[PDB]
Amino acid sequence: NRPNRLIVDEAINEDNSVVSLSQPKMDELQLFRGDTVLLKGKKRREAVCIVLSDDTCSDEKIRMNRVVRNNLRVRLGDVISIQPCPDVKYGKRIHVLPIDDTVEGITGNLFEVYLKPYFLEAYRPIRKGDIFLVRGGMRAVEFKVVETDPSPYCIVAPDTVIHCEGEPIKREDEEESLNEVGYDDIGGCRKQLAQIKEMVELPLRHPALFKAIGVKPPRGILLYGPPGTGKTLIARAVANETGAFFFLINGPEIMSKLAGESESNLRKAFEEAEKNAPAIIFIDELDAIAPKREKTHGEVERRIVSQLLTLMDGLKQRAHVIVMAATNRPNSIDPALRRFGRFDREVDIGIPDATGRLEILQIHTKNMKLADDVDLEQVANETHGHVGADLAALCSEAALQAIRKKMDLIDLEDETIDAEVMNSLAVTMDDFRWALSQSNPSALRETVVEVPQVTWEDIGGLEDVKRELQELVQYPVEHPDKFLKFGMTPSKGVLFYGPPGCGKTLLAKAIANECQANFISIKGPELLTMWFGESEANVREIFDKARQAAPCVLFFDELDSIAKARGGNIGDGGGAADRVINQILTEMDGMSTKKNVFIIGATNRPDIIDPAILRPGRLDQLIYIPLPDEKSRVAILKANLRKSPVAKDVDLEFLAKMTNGFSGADLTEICQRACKLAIRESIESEIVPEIRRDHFEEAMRFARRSVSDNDIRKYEMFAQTLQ
Amino acid sequence: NGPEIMSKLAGESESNLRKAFEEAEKNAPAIIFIDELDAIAPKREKTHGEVERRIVSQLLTLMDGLKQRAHVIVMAATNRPNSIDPALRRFGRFDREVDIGIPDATGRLEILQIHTKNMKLADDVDLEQVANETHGHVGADLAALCSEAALQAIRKKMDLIDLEDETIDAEVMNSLAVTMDDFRWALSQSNPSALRETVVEVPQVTWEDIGGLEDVKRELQELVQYPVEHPDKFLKFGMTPSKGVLFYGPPGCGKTLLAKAIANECQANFISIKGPELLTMWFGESEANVREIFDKARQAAPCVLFFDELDSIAKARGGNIGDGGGAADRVINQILTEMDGMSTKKNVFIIGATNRPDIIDPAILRPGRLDQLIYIPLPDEKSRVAILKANLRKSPVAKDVDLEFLAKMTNGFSGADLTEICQRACKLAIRESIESEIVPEIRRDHFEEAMRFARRSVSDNDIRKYEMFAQTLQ
Numbered sequence A: 001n002r003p004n005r006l007i008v009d010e011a012i013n014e015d016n017s018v019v020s021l022s023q024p025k026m027d028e029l030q031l032f033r034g035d036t037v038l039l040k041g042k043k044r045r046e047a048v049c050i051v052l053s054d055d056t057c058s059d060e061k062i063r064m065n066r067v068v069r070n071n072l073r074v075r076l077g078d079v080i081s082i083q084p085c086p087d088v089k090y091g092k093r094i095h096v097l098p099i100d101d102t103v104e105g106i107t108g109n110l111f112e113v114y115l116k117p118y119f120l121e122a123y124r125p126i127r128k129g130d131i132f133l134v135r136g137g138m139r140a141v142e143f144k145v146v147e148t149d150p151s152p153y154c155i156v157a158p159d160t161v162i163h164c165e166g167e168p169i170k171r172e173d174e175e176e177s178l179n180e181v182g183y184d185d186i187g188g189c190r191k192q193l194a195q196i197k198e199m200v201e202l203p204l205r206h207p208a209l210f211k212a213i214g215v216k217p218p219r220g221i222l223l224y225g226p227p228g229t230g231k232t233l234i235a236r237a238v239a240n241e242t243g244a245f246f247f248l249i250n251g252p253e254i255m256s257k258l259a260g261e262s263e264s265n266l267r268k269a270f271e272e273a274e275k276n277a278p279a280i281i282f283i284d285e286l287d288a289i290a291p292k293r294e295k296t297h298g299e300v301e302r303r304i305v306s307q308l309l310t311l312m313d314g315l316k317q318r319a320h321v322i323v324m325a326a327t328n329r330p331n332s333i334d335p336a337l338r339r340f341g342r343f344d345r346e347v348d349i350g351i352p353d354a355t356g357r358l359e360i361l362q363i364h365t366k367n368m369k370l371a372d373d374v375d376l377e378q379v380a381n382e383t384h385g386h387v388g389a390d391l392a393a394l395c396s397e398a399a400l401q402a403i404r405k406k407m408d409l410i411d412l413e414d415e416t417i418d419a420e421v422m423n424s425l426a427v428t429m430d431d432f433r434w435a436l437s438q439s440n441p442s443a444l445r446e447t448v449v450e451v452p453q454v455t456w457e458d459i460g461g462l463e464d465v466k467r468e469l470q471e472l473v474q475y476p477v478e479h480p481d482k483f484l485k486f487g488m489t490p491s492k493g494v495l496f497y498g499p500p501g502c503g504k505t506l507l508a509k510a511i512a513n514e515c516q517a518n519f520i521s522i523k524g525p526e527l528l529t530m531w532f533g534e535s536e537a538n539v540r541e542i543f544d545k546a547r548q549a550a551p552c553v554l555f556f557d558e559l560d561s562i563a564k565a566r567g568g569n570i571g572d573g574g575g576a577a578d579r580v581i582n583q584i585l586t587e588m589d590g591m592s593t594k595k596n597v598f599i600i601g602a603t604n605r606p607d608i609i610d611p612a613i614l615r616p617g618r619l620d621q622l623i624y625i626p627l628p629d630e631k632s633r634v635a636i637l638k639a640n641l642r643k644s645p646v647a648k649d650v651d652l653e654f655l656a657k658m659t660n661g662f663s664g665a666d667l668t669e670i671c672q673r674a675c676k677l678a679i680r681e682s683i684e685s686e687i688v689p690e691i692r693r694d695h696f697e698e699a700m701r702f703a704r705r706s707v708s709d710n711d712i713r714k715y716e717m718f719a720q721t722l723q
Numbered sequence B: 001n002g003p004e005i006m007s008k009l010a011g012e013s014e015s016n017l018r019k020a021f022e023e024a025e026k027n028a029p030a031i032i033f034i035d036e037l038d039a040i041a042p043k044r045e046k047t048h049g050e051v052e053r054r055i056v057s058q059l060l061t062l063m064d065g066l067k068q069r070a071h072v073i074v075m076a077a078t079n080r081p082n083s084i085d086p087a088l089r090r091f092g093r094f095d096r097e098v099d100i101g102i103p104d105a106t107g108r109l110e111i112l113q114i115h116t117k118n119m120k121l122a123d124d125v126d127l128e129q130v131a132n133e134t135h136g137h138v139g140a141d142l143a144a145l146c147s148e149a150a151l152q153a154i155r156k157k158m159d160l161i162d163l164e165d166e167t168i169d170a171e172v173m174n175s176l177a178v179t180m181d182d183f184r185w186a187l188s189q190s191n192p193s194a195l196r197e198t199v200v201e202v203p204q205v206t207w208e209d210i211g212g213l214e215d216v217k218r219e220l221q222e223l224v225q226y227p228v229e230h231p232d233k234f235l236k237f238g239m240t241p242s243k244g245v246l247f248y249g250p251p252g253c254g255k256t257l258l259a260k261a262i263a264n265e266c267q268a269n270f271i272s273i274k275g276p277e278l279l280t281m282w283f284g285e286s287e288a289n290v291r292e293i294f295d296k297a298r299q300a301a302p303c304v305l306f307f308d309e310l311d312s313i314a315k316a317r318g319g320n321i322g323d324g325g326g327a328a329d330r331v332i333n334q335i336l337t338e339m340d341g342m343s344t345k346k347n348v349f350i351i352g353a354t355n356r357p358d359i360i361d362p363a364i365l366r367p368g369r370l371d372q373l374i375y376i377p378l379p380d381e382k383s384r385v386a387i388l389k390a391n392l393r394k395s396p397v398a399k400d401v402d403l404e405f406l407a408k409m410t411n412g413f414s415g416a417d418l419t420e421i422c423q424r425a426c427k428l429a430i431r432e433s434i435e436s437e438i439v440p441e442i443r444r445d446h447f448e449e450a451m452r453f454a455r456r457s458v459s460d461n462d463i464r465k466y467e468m469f470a471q472t473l474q
């Protein structure tokens, strides 16, 4: 069906003039590492770009940022017609003009601030009619190629002349502003966007299909997540990216309207969103309107909720829309809205993780001139509990800082600041430092899902166990066909045990990174927090946010905590079971054996655990993790000094023979102690830095042995029957 | 619809109902079906407000309002008894009740055949297979399943082929097929997210899964089979049938497989109240739920209300040592009230199991409650041979593998133990076929290597414990 017709998918190379294709695809069309291509799309338009090779690209697709996509008048998924074009010769004269609605405010030399560094020996293959976008000066300006000498298209060579009639052009109707929202404006939310897409794909892109297929398209999508996540943002970008109409409904907006006029706006809204369908009616603060819980008091209040349920179902189905909504949590809303037929589909958008926050920052700085010393990653790595918005405001209070110094002290009072100036202004890693430093980091923080930021390189020794872990998790998911071959059902989870500080936790994380799964750590104190408050009900809440994030490894640290608390050794008249541990057994048993959630329980006190968690069907496998041996010790030091100023003369294999009854934790202690000397040095001389030998040998002075030989044996006798 | 009428302005509400009934009497015979009943008539503590109150009354006057002359039937629906308002139960309105719990094995299967009876299913598609893995799935959860299962087989076939039209062709859709592989993806989604509540079902196991213990098997039928399939005789002599049994003995000997298998025999429902749930009530001081149970069991007869780890509450509170108090406790007590209350003449048989007879409240052994005490000892040389076969029935048993042999290798083992040794052989076999590729039939060198990590759950001390307990207990 013509191997010159592809499906436009998002891009990996953000450059305005690039369209990536797989290496095997470029061989079927016969194009090299730079062949200028001529792209053809709907609304009878064309564009010229540079083809490249992308491995992550399937032969069935062509990556292209939004500028490209827009100029063709296509949306992700459509069909376009590529074509080599080795006849485009260097242009002569190029007339480009800014668009009034992307300059209101800046003045001066546009040709110097934007245009110039843009084509600066870029040899960009533009066309007559294109609309490229240039960033810089804490903003983005859109230019429309009015006339190119080698019309219609030519390559921009350091010779080609460039005009700027300094008279901004109005925005043409069918020209969506590249200023609006799109998937390129959402960071860290991958798994989520994935789901949401295939959901609205067919219905919002291919209406007709349903005019003939007897299949019902999910009507309602509900978006979870705490305030800031960016539930709304996503919902809008979904519509702008599918061309679908978008009607926003704010919560207090409708609950502010006089009693009676309220049922009016909703009915009125829906009705009007059906008129421009396809569409996404996106309710903002759903819970402010529909929380029909114990909290349901009053006539107005009740009737309002009903008004919706009659409209949620009210979707004549004939109608062609999708109702997206958002809330702070399941319990906020009213159960009636979950009824299979309204908000049947749910998507959680928890806080951002390591890579997330980093991905976000690159989005909110993609317009300002960042300084060399600026370490974007650095920031992402210190903002443990930061939502999307908390990061945005961060860059704002971080740039406003680099402003109250540069052009502010220089001070350029005007009715409109110059653009050359703003492009010269730079924000330094030092300005961001000040941002965090403010009380702005006040980004709420709750239970955290993520990905393990550690590998097996951080785990010294214990190789025999490493592979064993993969035998319980790697095989059951990457070879499920075999597990049926024999019939036996995979173990539900493991239980690490042994002395404290031997990597029982590093293992639980590292194995999850291996399987690229989410990590969920329920630490001892949280088990106790529930235990003391008699709120073991929360346990259920956990297993859900785990199931709502498969693949995952629900991990329980200090599983013995509740026992030690209640006494442990002596204890009381009672026995092994207790309220929190019990609930986790109901959920661990309940939890569908056929899901993708693996439980790992760790304890440095196997001798007090409720023997019910070791029953088959729950935590079958019992794995013992002993202190480090002569070998492991050598690798542990290296693993805990990897990212440190290790002097050359320093002997590691040596210390491995100095210590014996040590655990990873102990060795680690001796390490920092060497560093607490090194920093005590460099800070002393100034008022020269590479941690050396005389440091460690002096750090052996205060060398301990967390694991006492008595206990040493304890685990030998426990790991007798336990084994 | 419920919110339909509770959405209408105050006043216009009493209008629609009256208006509705009136119009349903005009075309009679008819069924006036109220959807979300509970959202209009839950007149409970939650009864706050004028409009709210008056609306409920408006109905009661219309429920009775059925001139009887009129010729209609008012069907209604709700999530549970406690949701509604008691006034609606008055003998004359909603006097008849029907429960439609979740679907069971055969159910889900029957359903799927209904929502695929229109699409071209692939050969590899195993409809049953699905029904067997959707433990907690309602009707709708299964329907959407086929939708997200067909939409998947679509975003590949004619979608990648792309046939953009104001209307797709029919030859095409008839060629399109949904594969067992597309369904796999469905379940795989977060869609299974149905519900999971107090589960009633039928025993998916027979006596073929229970090795040895034949003497007991027939005994079970003597307590349940005779009293229902020959009730004419039980009156012949006068004696009243025992209300229930109490299995006991070491852990992992089939005390549970027996309780299930006997219910399959009588084709009855199975209801398993496991230890942790007894404790859940015990810790929350919510032993009130106990009553809720015995009901969903009387509203499901025939049935076997089975209580596992009935000893749980005892061990918890201490058991051996314990505290200043006695054998009774709040949860166990409530079950005695309900077990005594529960009409002797119904069709609900109680089975209580415990691997610790020595701590049970001796009141449950009183006549009228759990009279019969049956001891289930570990497996003998014979039983062991049959257990292996029973636990390897659906497995890649090599030919050269000797079963009668292992039966002489193990002694102090219980069904559970033998079972452990089994999977261990398999955890080697799968560790094999997975290692070569990167050929599959479980052989002998596997088991003999699986005897390495062979245990003995039942220790000889305890062994004797049940000998001395089963001395007076018998």
Ligand SMILES: Nc1ncnc2c1ncn2[C@@H]1O[C@H](COP(=O)(O)OP(=O)(O)O)[C@@H](O)[C@H]1O
Pocket: A185, A186, A187, A188, A189, A226, A227, A228, A229, A230, A231, A232, A233, A234, A326, A360, A363, A387, A388, A389, A390, A392
């Ligand atoms: N994941 C994200 N990617 C890019 N920007 C984000 C993200 N999360 C939050 N933001 C920023 O913070 C604001 C939060 O927006 P919004 O959609 O209204 O969130 P919420 O639904 O929690 O109220 C956005 O306008 C956006 O600029």
Ligand SMILES: Nc1ncnc2c1ncn2[C@@H]1O[C@H](COP(=O)(O)OP(=O)(O)O)[C@@H](O)[C@H]1O
Pocket: A458, A459, A460, A461, A462, A499, A500, A501, A502, A503, A504, A505, A506, A507, A602, A635, A636, A639, A640, A663, A664, A665, A666, A668
């Ligand atoms: N096997 C190991 N290899 C490298 N470092 C280790 C190892 N075991 C422990 N450590 C060090 O000691 C600390 C103890 O970590 P953790 O696994 O959480 O202890 P545990 O689980 O035994 O309570 C680690 O953060 C790490 O820096």
Ligand SMILES: Nc1ncnc2c1ncn2[C@@H]1O[C@H](COP(=O)(O)OP(=O)(O)O)[C@@H](O)[C@H]1O
Pocket: B209, B210, B211, B212, B213, B249, B250, B251, B252, B253, B254, B255, B256, B257, B258, B353, B355, B387, B390, B391, B414, B415, B416, B417, B419
């Ligand atoms: N008599 C038996 N025949 C076949 N398998 C058995 C037998 N007894 C125990 N098993 C195996 O061990 C498990 C123990 O089951 P169960 O009846 O629940 O033990 P118990 O009630 O004594 O605690 C079974 O699911 C089964 O796999």
